[PDB]
Amino acid sequence: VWGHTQLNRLSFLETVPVVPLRVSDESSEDRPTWSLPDIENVAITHKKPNGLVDTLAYRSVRTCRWLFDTFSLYRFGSITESKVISRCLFLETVAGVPGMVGGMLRHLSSLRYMTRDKGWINTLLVEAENERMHLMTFIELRQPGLPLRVSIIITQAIMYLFLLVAYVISPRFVHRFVGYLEEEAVITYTGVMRAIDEGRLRPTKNDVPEVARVYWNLSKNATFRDLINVIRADEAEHRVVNHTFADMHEKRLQNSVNPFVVLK
Amino acid sequence: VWGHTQLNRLSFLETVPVVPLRVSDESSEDRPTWSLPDIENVAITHKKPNGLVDTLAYRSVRTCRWLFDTFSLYRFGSITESKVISRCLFLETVAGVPGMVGGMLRHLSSLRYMTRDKGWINTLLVEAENERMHLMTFIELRQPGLPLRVSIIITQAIMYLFLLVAYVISPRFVHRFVGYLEEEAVITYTGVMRAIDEGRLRPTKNDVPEVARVYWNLSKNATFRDLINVIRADEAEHRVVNHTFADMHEKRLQNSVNPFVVLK
Ligand SMILES: CCCCc1cc(=O)oc2c(O)c(O)ccc12
Ligand SMILES: CCCCc1cc(=O)oc2c(O)c(O)ccc12
Ligand SMILES: [Fe+3]
Ligand SMILES: [Fe+3]
Ligand SMILES: [Fe+3]
Ligand SMILES: [Fe+3]
Numbered sequence: 001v002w003g004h005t006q007l008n009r010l011s012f013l014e015t016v017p018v019v020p021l022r023v024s025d026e027s028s029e030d031r032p033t034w035s036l037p038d039i040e041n042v043a044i045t046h047k048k049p050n051g052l053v054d055t056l057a058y059r060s061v062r063t064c065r066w067l068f069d070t071f072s073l074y075r076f077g078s079i080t081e082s083k084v085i086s087r088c089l090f091l092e093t094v095a096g097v098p099g100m101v102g103g104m105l106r107h108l109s110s111l112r113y114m115t116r117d118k119g120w121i122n123t124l125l126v127e128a129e130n131e132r133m134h135l136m137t138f139i140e141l142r143q144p145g146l147p148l149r150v151s152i153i154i155t156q157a158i159m160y161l162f163l164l165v166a167y168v169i170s171p172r173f174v175h176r177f178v179g180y181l182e183e184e185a186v187i188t189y190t191g192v193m194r195a196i197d198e199g200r201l202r203p204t205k206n207d208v209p210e211v212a213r214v215y216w217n218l219s220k221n222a223t224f225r226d227l228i229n230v231i232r233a234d235e236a237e238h239r240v241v242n243h244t245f246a247d248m249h250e251k252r253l254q255n256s257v258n259p260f261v262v263l264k
Numbered sequence: 265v266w267g268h269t270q271l272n273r274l275s276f277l278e279t280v281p282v283v284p285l286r287v288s289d290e291s292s293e294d295r296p297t298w299s300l301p302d303i304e305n306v307a308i309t310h311k312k313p314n315g316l317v318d319t320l321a322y323r324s325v326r327t328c329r330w331l332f333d334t335f336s337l338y339r340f341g342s343i344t345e346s347k348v349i350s351r352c353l354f355l356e357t358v359a360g361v362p363g364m365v366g367g368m369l370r371h372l373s374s375l376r377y378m379t380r381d382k383g384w385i386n387t388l389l390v391e392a393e394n395e396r397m398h399l400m401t402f403i404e405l406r407q408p409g410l411p412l413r414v415s416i417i418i419t420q421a422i423m424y425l426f427l428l429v430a431y432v433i434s435p436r437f438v439h440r441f442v443g444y445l446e447e448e449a450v451i452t453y454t455g456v457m458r459a460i461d462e463g464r465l466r467p468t469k470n471d472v473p474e475v476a477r478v479y480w481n482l483s484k485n486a487t488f489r490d491l492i493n494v495i496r497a498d499e500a501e502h503r504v505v506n507h508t509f510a511d512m513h514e515k516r517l518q519n520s521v522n523p524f525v526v527l528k
Binding site: 001002003006008009011012013015019020026028030035039041043045046096097100107108110111112116117118121129135136139144149156160236239243244247248251253259260261264 | 289304368
């Protein structure tokens with residue numbers, strides 16, 4: 001029904017009163033579609049670093065873990081559900097930026113040079129969205145306090161800036177860095193899952209939010225375990241896809257067709 | 265078959281030299297679908313400015329039309345296909361930016377305030393992608409000179425910066441500034457279609473580029489006019505959508521469900 005008669009109306013401000021809040025509309029239509037007993041078998045991998053650069057990405061990813069563990073007192077206390085979420089929550093605020101700047105920089109090159117991109121730009125932009133939906137999911141499980149609100153904001157500053165220039169200077173470094181982060185992402189979500197299983201953590205969000213049901217297409221019966229596990233598969237996708245974009249950069253392949261447009 | 269076994273592999277660098285370059289993958293799959301006899305009737309509109317803001321937007325967008333027409337010898341020549349393609353090519357290198365800075369900002373706000381976006385983001389993201397396809401098409405009907413190829417980059421720098429700080433200060437301003445740009449894009453692309461029809465322009469690439477032919481889903485018999493015709497629809501879509509957004513801004517509805525999610 002989207003025709004020239006709609007196209008020719010000056011504005012549509014007067015229709016915002018009558019248009020529902022739909023949870024399907026929070027995301028773009030490009031949703032993951034994992035099946036659960038498969039992705040159960042996601043596993044902690046570690047790509048060896050080649051050069052200085054891959055190493056620098058590592059040491060700095062490792063240093064970021066160290067910091068964010070000591071200061072988040074993940075290390076001293078007991079694995080609560082409240083410090084698991086409160087942790088990811090913070091962490092998805094940053095997870096949404098290296099997708100987005102990567103897309104937005106590639107897109108500017110592809111405009112200015114006037115050149116085909118071969119479906120990088122969209123894969124990166126959805127990683128950015130995919131992570132944003134982790135954050136839209138975790139926010140439903142736990143609204144954080146003024147402290148964390150403000151630590152997210154200063155941090156976004158630091159990061160949006162670091163990622164913008166680190167990506168100008170070295171897309172290889174960023175894709176390699178995000179790659180290294182996502183190994184940790186996957187450890188943190190398989191550790192969590194190990195914990196639910198063993199019984200060392202008994203989660204009271206066995207309601208899975210409406211956003212997260214339609215986005216990941218799960219049953220209404222989907223447990224908290226399930227939700228970690230699909231997100232743990234999203235994070236494995238990112239682990240390879242950016243370590244793939246890393247290597248492509250390594251071998252001057254940073255303008256080849258993105259192999260994953262095929263491999264969907 | 266995108267399951268754990270793939271997700272568990274360190275790279276896919278191997279595959280890169282055996283995966284094809286298919287013109288579909290250049291875009292996301294969130295493609296336009298018009299039919300030509302309907303969007304034949306797309307009109308030239310003009311929204312009233314309310315504020316000193318909407319005014320400013322309008323006067324900036326007119327001064328830009330003036331400049332561009334004057335520095336592009338459009339005012340003093342027999343309209344060629346060359347200068348039509350040349351003007352439209354340059355321009356999509358600036359159309360491709362607002363959607364991208366708009367989208368990313370809304371994204372970064374959603375991440376740091378941990379709040380819903382309600383599907384503005386992905387709209388501004390396919391706003392920008394669509395534009396960039398306009399440019400991928402025009403690149404193929406005419407590869408530009410060095411002197412334009414330069415101008416393009418110095419332009420991007422100015423504009424990327426401008427829109428980034430405009431969009432922080434008043435997206436209402438920018439979304440208007442686009443709204444009033446797309447009014448002038450429709451004017452032109454109609455004029456062009458008139459000029460084909462009145463016989464005064466004899467287009468020589470009625471081979472419509474593969475990129476486009478898939479993107480806009482046209483026949484193999486699709487003419488140049490036919491392409492102009494759709495591109496113009498897209499441009500009039502962006503005209504309402506941005507004015508709507510600048511209208512929503514104006515009434516403090518920059519958090520309301522993007523009306524157009526539904527109208528899709
Ligand atoms: C500095 C490494 C942080 C690891 C991490 C833990 C987590 O709980 O969730 C993450 C996560 O959701 C990511 O996307 C990336 C990294 C993590
Ligand atoms: C700065 C005014 C430009 C108007 C305009 C003319 C044109 O020939 O093509 C356009 C175009 O392709 C757009 O996407 C936006 C604006 C124009
Ligand atoms: Fe994550
Ligand atoms: Fe991540
Ligand atoms: Fe355009
Ligand atoms: Fe445009």
